[PDB]
């Protein structure tokens, strides 16, 4: 009743509190009370139905609804505390029944708790994913109603969690493409002024539109037109913090926009985009997002291309990108550049003649100019004249070392060195002129970094000019100011050593100059950081052990130098929150193709290490000393280890020093990556064998004792930023602790790490999962079984995407010879496989980002190799072929290659039957283009070759084939042989099962060779030696002499 509702709210709060305090009342009793509460909510629905006929206190009815909502808040606290499968299902179904569309209005007083608990409680997947896909559709309908109800103020608070759950551990919303479009339209209808869901819902929309872009690009075009409206919408408003996500979404369109550049999404869209780019600069008036000049681009390097737009299409190479992973400051400022790049992206390919001079060309515009010389230059195809005109302004800027010069130097030198073409001999000394600015840096450490880093080498790096600097390369260094860490590390010395190693090219005293440089390396502002500004080659960086081992390679000895196995071991770690935002979508994109001296140095180093000043520098120099000790053993230092132990004892407070120590352990692994001290030895990790064994590891014993200190799922994101990387390194250290100790102890340790906590390190934990404490099979088998028993101890945790995916990935670590064990491993493997070939995946309800990995594991499941999948892997493959996903589409593209040398005759025929399908829709979505790719692979597959030819005949409607031209020779390097499609079997024998039988539209675009070939073959076509029927009625179409045919 009306008053009974408030009485129930008070009684529920009091009873829940009293039961929780006493703990005598059973959680089963609490679940029964929750069932009674759901019954009371159903009674509330019945009372509303009764009030429909005759009015009984309608305002008091809403008041009773609010009171029952308070009672439901108490009961929801109880349910979040304790959840039973029938009870959780009852609560969820009551929540679902709460939404009444028939009424046309809802109090929504209890609406706050629902989605918040859904995202917060019962996360482990039996309870959560117990709500099936139909429940997700119902949630979509509820969100659609909320869109009309919100701004229902609490509908926004619920929609926050709704957007959090929209792209889930498995989200089939994009699978519901009509529902996907409807929900996208609903989301676009409320361009929210302020919403925590705005960024996550827009990100889910961006991922879905990215999926829609290659396959069914028509829905992608509808979404893109909506985004075109949203672009001017963003051009209207101004709020920088939300503008971060707004620009993120605009950039999500931006790869698709660059796609649409070739064939205009709108021919006039460029001018509108230019206006919106002016609005983008206006929004970027926030000086926080600023110029890329001195972005400080930590860890930039040459010989590996850049990823600023993060699209492989550019082929632009190695721009020194702001690290943005420092703990990632510049990315949002880099966001400003994208806005600039956006206007730079804007042809209004059309601005160059005017964009040459008019622009103020500020540093904020200068970074955009660098982006121009990369990408707009890629899209430019500028002739010699345009480059001749453009280079003049940058050259003049370089002439005067004014404020215009410094921000220019990097981009200008990059444009000079890297371009569409090369240059003439006239600019020869001009490189030294370029070198002058770098010479300027060689003493001026501040502006130095790029100059001393890039284009200080390129003349050496590209042997495209006269060796005039053969005397002049050391000339700037001749200032006795060569020793400079001001730039990207080790570049100058290493490149110079290589260059002078040409042919008597080092026949000069410059080896002594290198010796002086190394001596400076020994004491370069000894025991402390020299400078405070921008920290290049900093102690702040992890290490460059290659420099430590370098000197011998720098030394010229007869065939003695050089090594292998650099082993970065996740050094860049570009992953970052606020960088991980676009990264997981940016992880995958598969658009359809279109358009004794060293002994002396070490001896002095001992005395140098006898004194130290700084602590972070202590870590850096400890790494240097340990690497030299590995380097010395290569030439052949427990004292450096003792010094590092002292430095560690100094950092007694935090564990991030132990994180630096884990970096040093990764350094040992990189020394271990080197075969041994002598090198080129069959022994692996022998170079770090002393580091690992207690001998020469007395200080490492102390570090291991430090490691012995006790101190949704943690693998939250498939595309995971750092910290999850920190979790991976932490698990590595966990392994390292027991490794130094010399499992049941490892079992108790992984028990100390919570299942949710230990869920983070997929590859890291999987490595130990493959590892066995002893060679005895039973112990490792029992440990793996205990791991499965812990994952399924809460069957929901096993049901969770994180734990099951961890098991799936660890299976690949278990994918090996495994000769010793032959007992029950397959049984537990199948017990896992029941939901490893996920029951969701079996129902095609698996993860989208997880879908490609699932196919990769299914291929990694190799029935043909040794042991077949007892359950038909062919059946799963056929279901997946019926199944549809863009990641699964690229997986299907790869599966044709995977089929080769892996098709057992029965399995081959089973796949061939699925390989046979005449599909119309997937061609525009390129799914049937993937089928045509499989058909070309079948042309590469002699097995069922006649079937391959039949599938060639039936596979192509020729829709998009003419423009494709064997994917412009990508599918077939020489199409013309099969462009005139008369295959060996096809040309020699008329294609047949053994009204025109040949489909002209599937055959070719024009009459071309098709009609004449058919006319020529008509004689064999009529009598096709499989039946006498083909002769009949052939003469009616032939309109030729019958007597001649009979002859």
Numbering used by the authors: 15 to 165, 200 to 373, 377 to 399, 417 to 663, 682 to 722, 756 to 830, 855 to 885, 891 to 1142, ...
Provide the authors' own sentences about this structure as they appear in the paper.
The ataxia–telangiectasia mutated (ATM), an apical kinase that orchestrates the multifaceted DNA damage response, is the master regulator of genome stability, and is a critical therapeutic target in cancer. However, the activation mechanism of ATM/Tel1 in response to DNA damage remains largely unknown.
Previous cryo-EM structure of the ATM/Tel1 from Schizosaccharomyces pombe in the basal state has illustrated a dimer interface and the consecutive helical solenoids inhibiting the kinase activation. In its basal state, the PRD features fully ordered kα9b, kα9c, and the linker loop, which collectively create a complete obstruction to substrate access to the active site. This structural arrangement likely accounts for the significantly lower affinity of the CHK2 peptide to the basal-state ATM/Tel1. Upon activation, the Spiral shifts upward towards the FAT-Pincer, and the FAT harbors a coordinated conformational change, with the height reduced from 200 Å in the basal state to 164 Å. Two of the conformations, Structure 1 and Structure 3, which are closer to the basal and active states, respectively, do not bind to the substrate peptide. These structures were resolved at nominal global resolutions of 3.6 Å and 4.0 Å, respectively.
